[PDB]
């Protein structure tokens, strides 16, 4: 038959591309399988083209060669890149027509009941580019494109040829060729998902399990969980790196290379190798989309008082409301407090606790030296990306630093303010939900600009006020002993205090530099001299 008798889906070793292969089989091979009588009754024509594209290392070449193997017909012809160009005039067309001459001859000799011929073009963009938009040094490229267009669909009709083309930049291809009759079906290959990442990891480990060379402590599901945004090539590279790390432990190089050969017949791969490789060898080519929450939360969170729990509960309530509402697709909230209170860390924690698919943080740390237009463009891009997902959450921190505010005159950038005021009231497309969390340290200034009314609610973040809270914080950090704690309490318990947690940490670190007989005193002075505040 036209299909190899032994062919089956499982044998080609493809990963998680179930839908795409099914679509190809539906839209490309349905007609050739039905009996000639009914297809003749419909009198419909047959597809002749396919255009695969996507990011590098997804499986395009693998899919093409597997399709070639699946079909029982003449050995596929392969055009390896720009091998068809020649210096002599008129010889490129000679090759481009020699490719199709055999199929033309067979179709002439047998007619409608002839076999099928398959031709594979690799790096099509190298050959075929827009005729008008091209170098003027030589018209060779235009003649080549015209010859290909004439041969594929000319006055003479040929109907027993299938052409496969793979590329990476589909835009450059000429429009005249991507029309029905030449290449109508156009797929897009993308990064796999967790299930695809599990299937891919399974396809390679098979032999090691078969020969009992893999330790039982390895959990493939966990590995698939950690490896986010990876591709098939990167997964295979990770496997190879773990294998090499395991193998390296039986060679004594660096003076002269030797192998044990008697302690080297009991080799096995543990989970430690995979963990080591995942941090040293392989990094995802596609930049990790997960935010680096460690940078924003550098010392965790400690429950030194009720306000922390109150703020977290309010954030959870807001998240629930935005998740389970339909009359109000857009919600906003503002966190305000005195400096050195830990607003950014709390906002980051609130964002993390939610499980929304899309989460991003916009900070001025990246916009150094930028003009007042670059900032607007960056914010627009971030919000455009957020609009795509069904549920989105965005965090804007250090608003006053984002407007370039200075109290002398005063001065600020108007364009950014207007853009923000417009983006705080633009609802997303139908059937989508968005949440915005803003952070600031000067509420009166925002009140003056008349943007405090643009938000929906406000949350207050206080700083340490009573000596008991200070003692609790010291206990949680545990940087002083009981004697020193009693000494400090004897003084602090009498009155009240006013200090932020970050400044408290800085003061502790500065104090610990003195000799043991002085540290406590060094601490007290620093609290007394700087502690003058309401």
């Amino acid at each position: 038959s036209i299909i190899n008798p032994d062919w089956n889906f499982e044998k080609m070793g493809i990963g998680g591309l179930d839908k795409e292969f099914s679509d190809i089989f539906r839209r490309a091979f349905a007609s050739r399988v039905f009996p000639p009588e009914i297809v003749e009754q419909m009198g419909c024509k047959h597809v002749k083209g396919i255009l695969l594209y996507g990011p590098p290392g997804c499986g395009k070449t693998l899919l093409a060669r597997q399709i070639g193997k699946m079909l029982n017909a003449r050995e596929p012809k392969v055009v390896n890149g720009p091998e068809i160009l020649n210096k002599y005039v008129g010889e490129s067309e000679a090759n481009i027509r020699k490719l199709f001459a055999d199929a033309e001859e067979e179709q002439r000799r047998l007619g409608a009941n002839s076999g099928l011929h398959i031709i594979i073009f690799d790096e099509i963009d190298a050959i075929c580019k827009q005729r008008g938009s091209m170098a003027g040094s030589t018209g060779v490229h235009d003649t080549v494109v015209n010859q290909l267009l004439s041969k594929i669909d000319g006055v003479e009709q040929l109907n027993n040829i299938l052409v496969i083309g793979m590329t990476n930049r589909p835009d450059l291809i000429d429009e005249a060729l991507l029309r029905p009759g030449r290449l109508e079906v156009k797929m897009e290959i993308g990064l796999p998902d967790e299930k695809g990442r599990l299937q891919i990891l399974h396809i390679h480990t098979a032999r090691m399990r078969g020969h009992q060379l893999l330790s039982a402590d390895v959990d493939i599901k966990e590995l698939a969980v950690e490896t986010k945004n990876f591709s098939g090539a990167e997964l295979e590279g990770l496997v190879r790196a773990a294998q090499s790390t395991a193998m390296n432990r039986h060679i004594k190089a660096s003076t002269k290379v030797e192998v044990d050969m008697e302690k080297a017949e009991s080799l096995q791969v543990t989970r430690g190798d995979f963990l080591a490789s995942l941090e040293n060898d392989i990094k995802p080519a596609f930049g990790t989309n997960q935010e680096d929450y460690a940078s924003y939360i550098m010392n965790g969170i400690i429950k030194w008082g009720d306000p922390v729990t109150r703020v977290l509960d309010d954030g959870e309530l807001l998240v629930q409301q935005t998740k389970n509402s339909d009359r109000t697709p857009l919600v906003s909230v503002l966190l305000e407090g005195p400096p050195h209170s830990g607003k950014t860390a709390l906002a980051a924690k609130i964002a993390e606790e939610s499980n929304f698919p899309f989460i991003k943080i916009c900070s001025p740390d990246k916009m150094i030296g930028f003009s007042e237009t670059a900032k607007c463009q960056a914010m627009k891009k971030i919000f455009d990306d957020a609009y795509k997902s069904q549920l989105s959450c965005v965090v804007v921190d250090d608003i006053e630093r984002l407007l370039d505010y200075v109290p002398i005159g005063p001065r600020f950038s108007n364009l950014v303010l207007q853009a923000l005021l417009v983006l705080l009231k633009k609802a997303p497309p139908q059937g989508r939900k968005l949440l915005i969390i803003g952070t600031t340290s000067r509420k009166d200034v925002l009140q003056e600009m008349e943007m405090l009314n643009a938000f929906s609610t406000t949350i207050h973040v206080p700083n340490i006020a009573t000596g008991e809270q200070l003692l609790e914080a010291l206990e949680l950090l545990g940087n002083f002993k009981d004697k020193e704690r009693t000494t400090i309490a004897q003084q602090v318990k009498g009155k009240k205090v006013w200090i932020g947690i970050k400044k408290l940490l800085m003061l502790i670190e500065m104090s610990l530099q003195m000799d043991p007989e002085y540290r406590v005193r060094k601490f007290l002075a620093l609290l007394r001299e700087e502690g003058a505040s309401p």
Partner: peptide, 16 residues
């Protein structure tokens, strides 16, 4: 307006 810079060239050989 700055005049366009210089350009390279490509050559084609013919056989008699």
């Amino acid at each position: 307006m700055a005049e366009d810079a210089d350009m390279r060239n490509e050559l084609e050989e013919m056989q008699r």
